[PDB]
Every structure is written in structure tokens, then in C-alpha cells.
Design a protein around this ligand. Structure first.
Ligand SMILES: [Zn+2]
Ligand SMILES: [Zn+2]
Ligand SMILES: [Zn+2]
Ligand SMILES: [Zn+2]
Lengths: 71, 263
């Protein structure tokens, strides 16, 4: 609902580089991934819009829930 | 042990002397409970912010799942990768953190007995990356039954890089809950599977979450016999030697047969 994953284009490999793009747009970094070219973040609607439009950013998607497949 | 172990033909491997020794299987679930006098959890890590102990399982499903991997592959080493909390749910990011852990820590097999009707580009990146790293990645296909002609396979089982495991009963009949679609790869026993529970208990659980670790366990058996086969070769052997049961939409390649997959 306001938890997101922010995917990056090439050349944003360090956490510091990912974190700076997210913060510059008003977002709050949660965790940078190590292999996957992305980071989790909490973002308001303005930050989501601005990140989507940023040339560094490949996507912004909801950090959605997955569930155990057991009764 | 469960009925499902004989059903998949795991005892043929045990007889030859292959029980999964030196094979590391990461169980991406709700933890694995230290409650048991035997699961030989060799390690783990938690990515649920408010539940930092991977050896505490407050849901019960992670513990059951681990037990099943072990009933198929008795000498395998399990790792508790806690990415779901007490309520059985986790954010995509916590699961990705679990998968990245497994990659970094040279896990041979990832089991994911979890799902969502909707995908995430980052989660597809993680599973794809794990597979490119040589990891066998296995997942429960979903418990969403039938919806017309439509696929009801859940994510991440729906991704091509992932082995999607549906559920049959002891008669080799598909369970009514077992998700369906072109993305379904194989079947394994997933109804009333008896396995380890928290508080030192044992009991039956049902779901594709129970089917998945039979395949993860099978992959460990194959790798212990054939340490030189790649993940691709392990996956292909499981698919290509499966017992055909009926329509691919309902059963994929059919029931895994570990004896036939390993030579
Ligand atoms: Zn045996
Ligand atoms: Zn026990
Ligand atoms: Zn698949
Ligand atoms: Zn061999």
C-alpha cells in the first residue's frame, strides 16, 4: 500500500547509489539487494511518481504479500 | 516417515547408499523449529523484521516442510531461511533477501512452499539469478483449484525458471485444491502428509506446500548420487522421467520418480 521495490537500470550497483536516488525523491530505503538490481523502500504517492520518471529507475512495484500454501 | 517417500520411489536411492549427504537445502518458510531431536538444521537466517529467530516456527508450516525434505533425503543438511512470519505471510523483499542468502551461502536447493496470485519483477530476477547460479529452485504450484481454462498457478511457481509442484493423493489422483495451468511442471504427494511440527509434535498437513519438499528432497538425492550434474540436468531428469498421469494442464509431466531420474 506504501511498501515498494524500486528496480534500477545499469550503473547503480552499490547500495549508496540506490539509496541516493530513492532519498533524492523523498523515499526511505529499507534494504538494498545484492544480486537483484533493486531495493525495498517506503514511498508516498509523490515519491512513487517521481521515481518512475527518474532515468535511473527501471520500475517501481508494490512489495506485495506471499503466503504459505498449506492448510 | 510419510507414505509419500515410497510413492516418489525414494527408497531405491537409499538402498544404493544415497540419502542426500553433503547437499544443502534451504527451506524458505516460517522458520524451522529447534523443537525436534533430529532435523539437523545446519544453519539459517531470518528476514522477517519482527521475528528474528529462524529456529522459532510460530506458524508450523516451515517445520513440516523441512521434515518432508528430510524424510526423502535423511542425510541432507537443512537451512532455516525465515521469510514468512507467524501468520504465514511475507513481503516479496523478505523472500528475495532469503533467496539472496541461499545464493551467497552456496545452497544446492531452494524450497519455496509459498505463493501469490500476482508476480513481482524483483522476485522473478531473484529466482532467475539463483538458477543461473546453479541452484535447483522448487516451489508449491498453488492451492487455487480450477478456474475455467485459466491458469491458477501461483507466483513464484509460475515463473519458467522455477519447478512448479502440484499435489496428488496416495492414489496418484490430483487433489481438488491443486492449482492448474501450462506452468505446472510435476506432481508429488500433498494430501494428509505426516511430518514434523512445532512443540516436538507430528501431524498431517495438506497442500502443494507439502508436495514441493518431496521434489526438493528428490533433487538432494539425485545430487548426492550425481554431484557433477548441473541444476538444469537435475531438473530435466525429474521432468523427463516422471510417471505420466493425464493432462499436462492438471498434472504437468506427472508424478516424480527419483529411481528413474538418477543413473
Ligand atoms: Zn529409506
Ligand atoms: Zn523430531
Ligand atoms: Zn514453472
Ligand atoms: Zn553421476
Amino acid at each position: 500500500e506504501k511498501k515498494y521495490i524500486v528496480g534500477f537500470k545499469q550503473g547503480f550497483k552499490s547500495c549508496a547509489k540506490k539509496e541516493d536516488v530513492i532519498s533524492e525523491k523523498g523515499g526511505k530505503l529499507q534494504k538494498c539487494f545484492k544480486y537483484v538490481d533493486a531495493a525495498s523502500a517506503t514511498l508516498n504517492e509523490k515519491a512513487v511518481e517521481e521515481l518512475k520518471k527518474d532515468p535511473s529507475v527501471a520500475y517501481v512495484e508494490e512489495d506485495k504479500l506471499y503466503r504459505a500454501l498449506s492448510a | 516417515v510419510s507414505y509419500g517417500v515410497a510413492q516418489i520411489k525414494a527408497p531405491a536411492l537409499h538402498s544404493q547408499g544415497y540419502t542426500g549427504s553433503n547437499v544443502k537445502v534451504a527451506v524458505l518458510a516460517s522458520g524451522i523449529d529447534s523443537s525436534h531431536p533430529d532435523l539437523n538444521v545446519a544453519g539459517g537466517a531470518s528476514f522477517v523484521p519482527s521475528e528474528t529467530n529462524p529456529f522459532q516456527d510460530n506458524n508450523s508450516h516451515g517445520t513440516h516442510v523441512a521434515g518432508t525434505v528430510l524424510a526423502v533425503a535423511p542425510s541432507a543438511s537443512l537451512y532455516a531461511v525465515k521469510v514468512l512470519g507467524a501468520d504465514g505471510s511475507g513481503q516479496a523483499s523478505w523472500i528475495i533477501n532469503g533467496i539472496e542468502w541461499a545464493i551467497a551461502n552456496n545452497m544446492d536447493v531452494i524450497n519455496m512452499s509459498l505463493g501469490s496470485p500476482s508476480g513481482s519483477a524483483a522476485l522473478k530476477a531473484a529466482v532467475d539469478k539463483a538458477v543461473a547460479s546453479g541452484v535447483v529452485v522448487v516451489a508449491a504450484a498453488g492451492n487455487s483449484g480450477t478456474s475455467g481454462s485459466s491458469s491458477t498457478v501461483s507466483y513464484p511457481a509460475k515463473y519458467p525458471s522455477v519447478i512448479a509442484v502440484g499435489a496428488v493423493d496416495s492414489s496418484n489422483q490430483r487433489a481438488p485444491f491443486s492449482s492448474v495451468g501450462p506452468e505446472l511442471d510435476v506432481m508429488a504427494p500433498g494430501v494428509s502428509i505426516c511430518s514434523t511440527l512445532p512443540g516436538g509434535k507430528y501431524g498431517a498437513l495438506s497442500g502443494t506446500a507439502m508436495a514441493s519438499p518431496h521434489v526438493a528432497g528428490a533433487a538432494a538425492l539425485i545430487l548426492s548420487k550425481h554431484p557433477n550434474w548441473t541444476n538444469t540436468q537435475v531438473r530435466s531428469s525429474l521432468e523427463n522421467t516422471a510417471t505420466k498421469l493425464g493432462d499436462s494442464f492438471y498434472y504437468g509431466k506427472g508424478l516424480i520418480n527419483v529411481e528413474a531420474a538418477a543413473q
